[PDB]
Design a protein around this ligand. Structure first.
Ligand SMILES: [Cl-]
Ligand SMILES: [Cl-]
Ligand SMILES: [Cl-]
Ligand SMILES: [Cl-]
Length: 104
């Protein structure tokens, strides 16, 4: 999992994923559900080696969370070729797995 820290480093890793799906975990260290799903998000990134996993810590990078309109954590946003295709909020491991498999 790549940690994302600015509006430009976000702009950039999207440009770079090529065709791969990109999943973005918006998390906080003080958020119980974010902490719970953190190592699961990491473990998925060991598995879906053809999917790009990024994390935005909303305290570290509030301007990125603000651009992304993220105020509840954890929120997962999904991007394909530069574009946001879907999102959801909550530490829902089944939904996370299912969505990764759904999105083309
Ligand atoms: Cl919380
Ligand atoms: Cl929260
Ligand atoms: Cl919460
Ligand atoms: Cl279910």
């Amino acid at each position: 999992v790549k940690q994302i820290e600015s509006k430009t480093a976000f702009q950039e890793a999207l440009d770079a994923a090529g065709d791969k799906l990109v999943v973005v975990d918006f998390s906080a260290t003080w958020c119980g559900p974010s902490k719970m799903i953190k190592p699961f998000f990491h473990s998925l990134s060991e598995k879906y080696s053809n999917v790009i996993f990024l994390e935005v810590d909303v305290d570290d990078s509030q301007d990125v969370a603000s651009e992304s309109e993220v105020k509840s954590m954890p929120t997962f946003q999904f991007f394909k070729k530069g574009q946001k295709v879907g999102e959801f909020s909550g530490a829902n491991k089944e939904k996370l797995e299912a969505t990764i498999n759904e999105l083309v």
